[PDB]
Amino acid sequence: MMVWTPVNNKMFETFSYLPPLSDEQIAAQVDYIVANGWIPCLEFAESDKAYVSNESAIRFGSVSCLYYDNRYWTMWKLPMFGCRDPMQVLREIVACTKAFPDAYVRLVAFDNQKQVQIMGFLVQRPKSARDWQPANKRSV
Amino acid sequence: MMVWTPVNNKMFETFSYLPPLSDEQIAAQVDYIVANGWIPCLEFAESDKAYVSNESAIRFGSVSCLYYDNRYWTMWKLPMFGCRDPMQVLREIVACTKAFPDAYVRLVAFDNQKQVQIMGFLVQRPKSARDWQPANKRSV
Amino acid sequence: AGFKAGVKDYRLTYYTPDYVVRDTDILAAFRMTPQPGVPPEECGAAVAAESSTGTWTTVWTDGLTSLDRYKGRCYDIEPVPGEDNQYIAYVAYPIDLFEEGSVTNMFTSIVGNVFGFKALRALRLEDLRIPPAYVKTFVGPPHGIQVERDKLNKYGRGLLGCTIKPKLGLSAKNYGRAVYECLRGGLDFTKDDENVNSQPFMRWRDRFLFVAEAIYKAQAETGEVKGHYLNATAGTCEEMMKRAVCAKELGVPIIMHDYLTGGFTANTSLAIYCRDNGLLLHIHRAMHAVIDRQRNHGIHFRVLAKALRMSGGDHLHSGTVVGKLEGEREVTLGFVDLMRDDYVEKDRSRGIYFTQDWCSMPGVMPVASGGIHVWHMPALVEIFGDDACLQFGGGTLGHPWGNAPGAAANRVALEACTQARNEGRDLAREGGDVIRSACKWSPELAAACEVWKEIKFEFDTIDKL
Amino acid sequence: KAGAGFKAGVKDYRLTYYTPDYVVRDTDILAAFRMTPQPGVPPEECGAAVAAESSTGTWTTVWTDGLTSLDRYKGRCYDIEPVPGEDNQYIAYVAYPIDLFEEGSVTNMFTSIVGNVFGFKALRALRLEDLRIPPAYVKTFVGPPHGIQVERDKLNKYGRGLLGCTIKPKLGLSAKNYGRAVYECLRGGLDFTKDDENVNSQPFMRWRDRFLFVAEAIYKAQAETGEVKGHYLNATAGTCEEMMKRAVCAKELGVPIIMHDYLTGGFTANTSLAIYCRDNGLLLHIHRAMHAVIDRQRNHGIHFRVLAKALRMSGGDHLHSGTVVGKLEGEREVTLGFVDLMRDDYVEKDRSRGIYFTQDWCSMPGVMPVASGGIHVWHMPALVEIFGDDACLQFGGGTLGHPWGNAPGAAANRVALEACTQARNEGRDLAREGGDVIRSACKWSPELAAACEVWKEIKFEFDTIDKL
Amino acid sequence: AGAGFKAGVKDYRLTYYTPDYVVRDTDILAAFRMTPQPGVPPEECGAAVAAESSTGTWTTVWTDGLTSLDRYKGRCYDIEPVPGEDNQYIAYVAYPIDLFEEGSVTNMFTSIVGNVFGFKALRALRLEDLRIPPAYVKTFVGPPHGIQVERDKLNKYGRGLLGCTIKPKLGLSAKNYGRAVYECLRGGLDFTKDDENVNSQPFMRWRDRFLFVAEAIYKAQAETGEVKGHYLNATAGTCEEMMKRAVCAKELGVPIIMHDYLTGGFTANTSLAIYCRDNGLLLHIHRAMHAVIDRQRNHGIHFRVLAKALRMSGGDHLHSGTVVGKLEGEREVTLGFVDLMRDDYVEKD
Amino acid sequence: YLNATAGTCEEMMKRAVCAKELGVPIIMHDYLTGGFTANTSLAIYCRDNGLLLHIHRAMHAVIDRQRNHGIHFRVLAKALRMSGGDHLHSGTVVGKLEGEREVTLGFVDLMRDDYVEKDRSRGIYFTQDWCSMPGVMPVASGGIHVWHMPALVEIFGDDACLQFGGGTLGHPWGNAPGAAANRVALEACTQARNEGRDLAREGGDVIRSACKWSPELAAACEVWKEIKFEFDTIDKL
Amino acid sequence: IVGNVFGFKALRALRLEDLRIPPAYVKTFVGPPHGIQVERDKLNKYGRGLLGCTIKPKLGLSAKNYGRAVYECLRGGLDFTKDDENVNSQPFMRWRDRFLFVAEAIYKAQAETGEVKGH
Ligand SMILES: O=C(O)[C@@](O)(COP(=O)(O)O)[C@H](O)[C@H](O)COP(=O)(O)O
Ligand SMILES: O=C(O)[C@@](O)(COP(=O)(O)O)[C@H](O)[C@H](O)COP(=O)(O)O
Ligand SMILES: O=C(O)[C@@](O)(COP(=O)(O)O)[C@H](O)[C@H](O)COP(=O)(O)O
Ligand SMILES: [Mg+2]
Ligand SMILES: [Mg+2]
Ligand SMILES: [Mg+2]
Ligand SMILES: [Mg+2]
């Protein structure tokens, strides 16, 4: 019987429970975006603005329901409207992480029909971060 | 496309989006104050009280609308009523910054007819500050 | 021209085969089984009459108004393939007959008394065409799929839920304890069982508070937004509202309501409260099978689903197809579309009798729950896609290592199937392989797979097209 | 060393939920399920599954059971009796500890007992035939706003069944024409008239306009006849806020009674309304709209007797009971059975009438049965014989369908009722002398004679679906 | 790749002029009498009107890509020439039902006539008509009662109703007002009314007036044996004051009140109409200020649109002009909008 | 500015209450389409709960465009000042919507000042004494971009809010860069004026100088350099 | 006691010098919200008189300038500052604006000095 550790085991939504995605698996996800005609876009945030928090609620009456700070991240340039080339996306991931090596970066895609983010996963985590565990250390 | 950085890019209201003001440009702003017969005044604050915050709202009911801590700074001596000599203003800037070398210091001017501050900009930021960017690094 | 007392055939007034339906008419498809000797036309006319403007004998008052304007009309009758005494009677109802925004009123007319008529042996309402002009009179769901995902900041995969067990008997603190362990392992939500309201072994306010501590502890620990559908279902509206208010005051994200056992009137009020206060509303369909299980009599779930979308609900259980409760694949895919989409074309192969235009009313998140486990993940993702919430109650608290490991196992199975699909893999064919591969690096999943590997639910389907 | 611990995995429900030697407690809620298992599924297992998934268990073993006491909370299938001459049908009896239910909540009770079990793949059909509501649980409900005795006392009406009438056409009439029809009906001898179940608030007639005109009609008819009159103003609405606004208006108008469709409106809303009526002195007529969608078939659903008990608990001064002889189905024995369950304080078990459990209402007010639907003057003898004086007999088409209009139509029904009541009181057998009583009354009642002539040939006789 | 974001200005016509578009039965339609500036093509001007009254602005914004403009954009689908004018056109615009807030006339007007009338590119603009689809009509509570119900409550049938505005407009005391009202009503008039500008003033406070008017109403009714009424003005500076006056009328048991829907406003009017429905009060609507908007042929909003808007916001009565009186009202136009405010279905004419 | 404009006063208030409960600083209301009765109530609520109230003049042109019939905007502006509003759109003069300079400068004074003397050359027919009633912040919005900044600052001075919708979300690099370009242009012009430079004549040079160190502004200037709105004025004195 | 008697023609002048309020009547009054002891206990101030100060000019200052003066006064050692008796709500300064700015001032001075402050 293994115990799921509650210490330094932060997650990051979709795919964060799978082993770190290889560049080949990331390329596959990108092809998925293009194959479906979705709009690629990158977002990033410094460590202190990475996970949901409740700081702003100090200014609220009884209306904190479904309100959290840090859900919004910073947009990298603009959504890649029209983009039909997976290589363009992969290069922007590099451009973004190059500009902000010490920030969390996630790749997302928008569907303008349902008008909602249709996919997304973390592509970069600050190398100095130690608030998460590798697949082999999630349970003890 | 250049990306406006969200990291350590704090601003300070009027003129903070321009290149740092030279002593000549600062003197010109002072002449502007005197030429219009406005009342010069210096204000300062330690780093921890330089930017607006919500700390006191913890004591509030649902009345935080337009209430923020740290808007008020500390007055250096008194407003220079009757000042018609810009040199006088420049000397107080030197005296204030000398007395509080590690504090944020801003120059403002009052209009007693409309009874409101009619101008103002930062004249000193502690050398220890690492939450701002030089003009050429506001975007990457 | 004048009033003539006495009884006459309903068909003389209510069977109008040449009527051209209007785009504002509410249409109904009834699976009708007449008593021997009763012409299908007369039976269909009786249904239309007694669910709209007529009664058993001629009344003089008809002359004060315009029956042509208000009468329901049986405008078409088709024999049911393979049935000697079964027909699909189509009835058109003018929009003027319904109270704006009241599902209660719509049901009162259409299914109020006609199902008990001696002249018929059985009757089942298969579908309803809700016209845009009527859809627009409803507030509808508090938020809907897109807004829900935006508030939770969750995208790219199905959501994961879990019903706490045992159903009843747990104390408030033990409930919160179970919830915390469940959520911390990877599940997005946990929930009160449908029958968990307020009882001697656990009063509601005690549960709400401990669950709140659990939600926030799990959220802080994982870094992902968490929730637990706190049950507002109650004996009175006053009690229902007190519970919703408490959830609001605790700042929690979601509550639930058993719309059928609580009732449409109470449900609509709660949905409106949730819209005005920002609470997600999970809808449990308790009691639905009492009404929608049999093919010959009752109301098909697709109608109960449309009704809920109108009354209001962010989530609605849709069945699992492969779980412990019945749910034939084709009709399920049919009403799932009716629940989520803006426009669904007529498709009899899926039980969709009328083209349905939702005119932008928010879509409802389908919830697959009941007797499912890790080995069902491939099929579940294949059937529902990302816009659904898959819940594993026993499938989580039944894991040999506890709630957290059980939650991680389901979260892992889901993400592995989601990844595989995105890569172009055929879940219907490679499902097993995807799960087995995940087992190689996930001991939590491996443990779950071994426990339920031989468990499946395959029985003859009662609710067949 | 090691006692009973946690063992992950699936095992038969019967190992925990089938307890044939269990002795039911007097506080247990009992349920009689007519179940039809799928081929290969033992009745013991199917029965155990029903009890399990309607109380404390799920499809696989959960460790949390060990934190509490399953023996104390689990539902129990304690007896299974085969059904003669039927296709793989059994009556499975389940006992539920009182601890499993929220006090005064019919919604909660139904949620557990009929929440999910009807959809299990392991069974082909399921029907809840009866429920034994123990006094200890009955006492947690406010119950009916008033009840039969109080109602009669407030209306000052005794010695005969009450007379009602649904306004027609069902929909399409304006507020003023509604009031017009109501006044004409009431002034002729009817005690009540009512909004059709689907008459709420619509473009052709908004509710508040109807309430006002009906109030004028009620007071005019009462002043004219010298007998207390009423009209069930429908409070059924899309939301509780609208429902309450309508009840408040009736209160402010000083009118005696309102109505509510408890199933389409819902138990949560109905209970709130019943409580409001108790606290504000309003009589509450309950319409069972939608009930047949649930209680018509013998193999699946919930029998009306259970739906009737539920309403009595949730709250209602009146409740439609069927007519037996009218346009809607209602077998005599079954009907007489739930009528007793609706009105009486104590009803002994009697399978010849579909009464599976002895029911003790522990002084909860009795509900007035309402016979309505396709009945006319010739049916009066049968109706009086079946229901007795404690009931309300309604004639919608049977009044507004009279060749001379509403007032004469109302008089014809009132005359028929009083003549039948007098005959019975004198010792005559209504079941045998009914026609003679009616024909005799026709000699001095032109109104009744006209009604008799128009509907003499009309009868409703079909094969009964809901047979015992 | 595919369609991308290109910063910069481009003609509105490229996105908002769709001459082949087939209007949907749920679309709200507008007919604009448009007078473009010289050098501005009619289609571009019509496109600008459609764009700036729905989803677009003066330059290309990247955010359009996040949603679907095809689904939300307003469309100028037809440009008709105006006989006797070589620089005036009727531009037709279709607005998807999704663009409007249910039951809000205020919102409908904010989009359709919010900003386009001030564009430099056009010299004049007038909204002539609006096609309100049944799907949108159903989102409104509508008038508190309506013609049939009003007659049924007053028990008056077979003839037009008779009213009368007390005079002088302003300057009369509360008691003298009630004095004139009683004398008017007792002679055969069904109603009398506060002048549109009679609200609450130094020479006569509203509550004093309401009370004396009530005495006059009841005295006249008892004397004649016919139901009587006087439109007590609820028009006020704030909604709180408006409701206080409506509440007083309710408490006095009087039959009718009035409201100046344009000077008071649609938001206030809708709230009052809803109050009247839930409390059984008839609501007379005065159209004060309408001529400021609907008098000129080249610019503004025709009264027929202002009438449809009021029917939606809610009103039991609405002034329609007299044709033959002191105020303007062309016969054919008047007959047309009278049908639009009274009937259930009105054919294009 | 979160919009409180609604179909009924009840809905309008529910929206203002939510803004209050969230602790946010400002809401808006379309005073003409919503109406004066509803607006006055909203302004009073804002005074009593500390919310700033931005007023949008939607529909005003339906009434104030033509010289021969209607109500001139200056009267609609006085009415709003009385009813209540912290901000009020005043037009831009140089933007996509009409607004003749002299007429505009006139009602801007009527909106902000405590005392305005009769001046027919600006359409001011009567001397207006506001007797200390608070001034309303004029809002210049509609079809304006970075190149208009010099003229806007020269026309309105510091007491005004300049709005760039398309002028921000239309920037080739996005909203943040678009915002920076406008903020830079504004501060550059403000600094130049304070230094004594004539914005009516040196405006273009001020902007070009700022472009040298502001790539954000440079990109904005390139896209809209040739965009101007010059048409015959309908609302002439 | 002082309702009408001071205006009687029969007298030329009248002045109420004192009143004996008996305990039986005193007990019928709620009295002061707190009192000296409670006040000192809530402020946590003992051993010296309290120090206050009326802001000036009496009238004419804006809400923010009022808070500005208050902060500067309190931070220097004063326990309290106060609105002048005639400072209620006026065109030059509406009450709610003043209350908000003064609150910022009270909290800033208290945080700065470590002593409880009030206005
Ligand atoms: O009570 C139960 O059985 C559940 O909590 C599931 O438990 P498990 O997860 O342990 O199976 C759900 O309510 C059912 O899914 C409802 O049925 P449906 O979804 O068909 O409405
Ligand atoms: O809608 C109708 O048909 C009725 O108004 C009767 O009309 P008539 O009097 O004209 O027949 C009643 O609601 C039914 O009796 C209800 O059925 P039940 O009593 O079985 O619930
Ligand atoms: O809808 C619009 O057009 C705007 O949002 C501006 O958009 P841009 O910034 O993209 O032009 C403003 O409401 C107008 O300025 C109103 O006109 P005015 O100020 O004349 O009342
Ligand atoms: Mg459950
Ligand atoms: Mg009925
Ligand atoms: Mg007048
Ligand atoms: Mg003083």
mmCIF file of N, CA, C and O in Angstrom, chain C residues 191-231:
data_model
loop_
_atom_site.group_PDB
_atom_site.id
_atom_site.type_symbol
_atom_site.label_atom_id
_atom_site.label_comp_id
_atom_site.label_asym_id
_atom_site.label_seq_id
_atom_site.Cartn_x
_atom_site.Cartn_y
_atom_site.Cartn_z
ATOM 1 N N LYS C 191 -18.978 14.545 -4.124
ATOM 2 C CA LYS C 191 -20.362 15.004 -3.937
ATOM 3 C C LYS C 191 -21.128 14.248 -2.881
ATOM 4 O O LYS C 191 -20.769 13.120 -2.516
ATOM 5 N N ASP C 192 -22.184 14.887 -2.378
ATOM 6 C CA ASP C 192 -23.069 14.266 -1.403
ATOM 7 C C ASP C 192 -23.859 13.256 -2.226
ATOM 8 O O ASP C 192 -24.151 13.507 -3.396
ATOM 9 N N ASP C 193 -24.198 12.115 -1.642
ATOM 10 C CA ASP C 193 -24.992 11.148 -2.383
ATOM 11 C C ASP C 193 -26.339 11.860 -2.533
ATOM 12 O O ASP C 193 -26.659 12.748 -1.736
ATOM 13 N N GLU C 194 -27.125 11.489 -3.540
ATOM 14 C CA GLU C 194 -28.405 12.157 -3.753
ATOM 15 C C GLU C 194 -29.325 12.163 -2.533
ATOM 16 O O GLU C 194 -30.055 13.133 -2.313
ATOM 17 N N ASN C 195 -29.286 11.098 -1.735
ATOM 18 C CA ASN C 195 -30.146 11.019 -0.558
ATOM 19 C C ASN C 195 -29.523 11.611 0.702
ATOM 20 O O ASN C 195 -30.117 11.563 1.781
ATOM 21 N N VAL C 196 -28.322 12.163 0.564
ATOM 22 C CA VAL C 196 -27.661 12.811 1.689
ATOM 23 C C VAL C 196 -28.154 14.258 1.707
ATOM 24 O O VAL C 196 -27.767 15.070 0.862
ATOM 25 N N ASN C 197 -29.026 14.566 2.661
ATOM 26 C CA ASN C 197 -29.575 15.907 2.810
ATOM 27 C C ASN C 197 -29.195 16.336 4.226
ATOM 28 O O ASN C 197 -28.109 16.864 4.455
ATOM 29 N N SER C 198 -30.090 16.100 5.176
ATOM 30 C CA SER C 198 -29.824 16.404 6.577
ATOM 31 C C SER C 198 -30.505 15.299 7.385
ATOM 32 O O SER C 198 -31.723 15.115 7.297
ATOM 33 N N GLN C 199 -29.714 14.561 8.157
ATOM 34 C CA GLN C 199 -30.229 13.448 8.947
ATOM 35 C C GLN C 199 -29.568 13.356 10.327
ATOM 36 O O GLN C 199 -28.558 14.009 10.587
ATOM 37 N N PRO C 200 -30.139 12.544 11.236
ATOM 38 C CA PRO C 200 -29.602 12.373 12.594
ATOM 39 C C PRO C 200 -28.110 12.046 12.672
ATOM 40 O O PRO C 200 -27.404 12.552 13.542
ATOM 41 N N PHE C 201 -27.635 11.193 11.769
ATOM 42 C CA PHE C 201 -26.228 10.803 11.761
ATOM 43 C C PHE C 201 -25.326 11.900 11.195
ATOM 44 O O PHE C 201 -24.104 11.853 11.351
ATOM 45 N N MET C 202 -25.929 12.883 10.531
ATOM 46 C CA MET C 202 -25.164 13.985 9.947
ATOM 47 C C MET C 202 -26.072 15.129 9.511
ATOM 48 O O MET C 202 -26.801 15.015 8.522
ATOM 49 N N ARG C 203 -26.034 16.225 10.262
ATOM 50 C CA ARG C 203 -26.842 17.391 9.935
ATOM 51 C C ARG C 203 -26.119 18.156 8.830
ATOM 52 O O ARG C 203 -24.889 18.176 8.784
ATOM 53 N N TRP C 204 -26.882 18.785 7.941
ATOM 54 C CA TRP C 204 -26.284 19.476 6.808
ATOM 55 C C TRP C 204 -25.260 20.574 7.080
ATOM 56 O O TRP C 204 -24.191 20.567 6.471
ATOM 57 N N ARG C 205 -25.556 21.512 7.979
ATOM 58 C CA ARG C 205 -24.600 22.591 8.231
ATOM 59 C C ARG C 205 -23.264 22.065 8.754
ATOM 60 O O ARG C 205 -22.211 22.627 8.447
ATOM 61 N N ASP C 206 -23.292 20.994 9.540
ATOM 62 C CA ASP C 206 -22.036 20.428 10.031
ATOM 63 C C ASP C 206 -21.232 19.932 8.826
ATOM 64 O O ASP C 206 -20.031 20.191 8.720
ATOM 65 N N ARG C 207 -21.904 19.237 7.910
ATOM 66 C CA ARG C 207 -21.247 18.703 6.723
ATOM 67 C C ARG C 207 -20.680 19.801 5.830
ATOM 68 O O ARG C 207 -19.550 19.697 5.347
ATOM 69 N N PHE C 208 -21.469 20.846 5.607
ATOM 70 C CA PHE C 208 -21.043 21.962 4.767
ATOM 71 C C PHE C 208 -19.727 22.558 5.272
ATOM 72 O O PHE C 208 -18.821 22.823 4.485
ATOM 73 N N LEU C 209 -19.621 22.762 6.584
ATOM 74 C CA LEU C 209 -18.403 23.329 7.161
ATOM 75 C C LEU C 209 -17.179 22.424 7.037
ATOM 76 O O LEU C 209 -16.112 22.883 6.632
ATOM 77 N N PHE C 210 -17.316 21.150 7.392
ATOM 78 C CA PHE C 210 -16.180 20.238 7.293
ATOM 79 C C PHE C 210 -15.776 20.032 5.840
ATOM 80 O O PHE C 210 -14.591 19.936 5.526
ATOM 81 N N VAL C 211 -16.760 19.968 4.948
ATOM 82 C CA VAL C 211 -16.460 19.789 3.536
ATOM 83 C C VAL C 211 -15.714 21.017 3.026
ATOM 84 O O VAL C 211 -14.823 20.906 2.189
ATOM 85 N N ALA C 212 -16.078 22.189 3.536
ATOM 86 C CA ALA C 212 -15.409 23.417 3.125
ATOM 87 C C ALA C 212 -13.931 23.321 3.490
ATOM 88 O O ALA C 212 -13.067 23.660 2.684
ATOM 89 N N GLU C 213 -13.635 22.856 4.702
ATOM 90 C CA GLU C 213 -12.243 22.729 5.125
ATOM 91 C C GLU C 213 -11.508 21.774 4.186
ATOM 92 O O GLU C 213 -10.372 22.028 3.788
ATOM 93 N N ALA C 214 -12.178 20.679 3.832
ATOM 94 C CA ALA C 214 -11.609 19.668 2.943
ATOM 95 C C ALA C 214 -11.333 20.204 1.539
ATOM 96 O O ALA C 214 -10.271 19.952 0.967
ATOM 97 N N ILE C 215 -12.298 20.927 0.976
ATOM 98 C CA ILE C 215 -12.133 21.497 -0.361
ATOM 99 C C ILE C 215 -10.899 22.391 -0.395
ATOM 100 O O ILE C 215 -10.016 22.226 -1.233
ATOM 101 N N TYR C 216 -10.851 23.344 0.529
ATOM 102 C CA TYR C 216 -9.740 24.280 0.597
ATOM 103 C C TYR C 216 -8.399 23.622 0.914
ATOM 104 O O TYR C 216 -7.366 24.055 0.407
ATOM 105 N N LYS C 217 -8.403 22.577 1.735
ATOM 106 C CA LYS C 217 -7.147 21.895 2.044
ATOM 107 C C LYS C 217 -6.639 21.195 0.782
ATOM 108 O O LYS C 217 -5.456 21.278 0.447
ATOM 109 N N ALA C 218 -7.542 20.513 0.081
ATOM 110 C CA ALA C 218 -7.179 19.803 -1.140
ATOM 111 C C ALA C 218 -6.721 20.766 -2.227
ATOM 112 O O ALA C 218 -5.768 20.488 -2.957
ATOM 113 N N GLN C 219 -7.405 21.899 -2.339
ATOM 114 C CA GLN C 219 -7.050 22.884 -3.351
ATOM 115 C C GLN C 219 -5.660 23.458 -3.098
ATOM 116 O O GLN C 219 -4.850 23.574 -4.021
ATOM 117 N N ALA C 220 -5.384 23.810 -1.845
ATOM 118 C CA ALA C 220 -4.085 24.367 -1.488
ATOM 119 C C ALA C 220 -2.971 23.347 -1.709
ATOM 120 O O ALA C 220 -1.878 23.694 -2.158
ATOM 121 N N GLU C 221 -3.261 22.087 -1.401
ATOM 122 C CA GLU C 221 -2.286 21.006 -1.536
ATOM 123 C C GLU C 221 -1.920 20.665 -2.981
ATOM 124 O O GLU C 221 -0.749 20.448 -3.300
ATOM 125 N N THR C 222 -2.924 20.637 -3.850
ATOM 126 C CA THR C 222 -2.729 20.283 -5.250
ATOM 127 C C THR C 222 -2.459 21.453 -6.190
ATOM 128 O O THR C 222 -1.779 21.292 -7.203
ATOM 129 N N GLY C 223 -3.001 22.622 -5.868
ATOM 130 C CA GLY C 223 -2.807 23.771 -6.733
ATOM 131 C C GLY C 223 -3.853 23.813 -7.837
ATOM 132 O O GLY C 223 -3.754 24.618 -8.768
ATOM 133 N N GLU C 224 -4.850 22.933 -7.744
ATOM 134 C CA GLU C 224 -5.931 22.893 -8.728
ATOM 135 C C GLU C 224 -7.240 23.234 -8.014
ATOM 136 O O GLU C 224 -7.433 22.855 -6.859
ATOM 137 N N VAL C 225 -8.134 23.948 -8.699
ATOM 138 C CA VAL C 225 -9.422 24.318 -8.109
ATOM 139 C C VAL C 225 -10.210 23.050 -7.783
ATOM 140 O O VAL C 225 -10.275 22.122 -8.587
ATOM 141 N N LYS C 226 -10.803 23.021 -6.596
ATOM 142 C CA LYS C 226 -11.564 21.864 -6.150
ATOM 143 C C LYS C 226 -12.991 22.234 -5.779
ATOM 144 O O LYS C 226 -13.293 23.392 -5.498
ATOM 145 N N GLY C 227 -13.860 21.231 -5.773
ATOM 146 C CA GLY C 227 -15.243 21.448 -5.409
ATOM 147 C C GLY C 227 -15.885 20.174 -4.886
ATOM 148 O O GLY C 227 -15.330 19.081 -5.027
ATOM 149 N N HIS C 228 -17.049 20.328 -4.266
ATOM 150 C CA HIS C 228 -17.826 19.211 -3.734
ATOM 151 C C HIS C 228 -19.282 19.640 -3.800
ATOM 152 O O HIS C 228 -19.669 20.608 -3.141
ATOM 153 N N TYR C 229 -20.095 18.936 -4.579
ATOM 154 C CA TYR C 229 -21.491 19.325 -4.684
ATOM 155 C C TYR C 229 -22.213 19.121 -3.356
ATOM 156 O O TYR C 229 -22.550 17.993 -2.991
ATOM 157 N N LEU C 230 -22.439 20.212 -2.630
ATOM 158 C CA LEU C 230 -23.160 20.143 -1.367
ATOM 159 C C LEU C 230 -24.655 20.118 -1.706
ATOM 160 O O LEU C 230 -25.156 20.975 -2.448
ATOM 161 N N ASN C 231 -25.362 19.130 -1.165
ATOM 162 C CA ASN C 231 -26.787 18.955 -1.444
ATOM 163 C C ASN C 231 -27.724 19.957 -0.777
ATOM 164 O O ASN C 231 -27.776 20.057 0.452
#
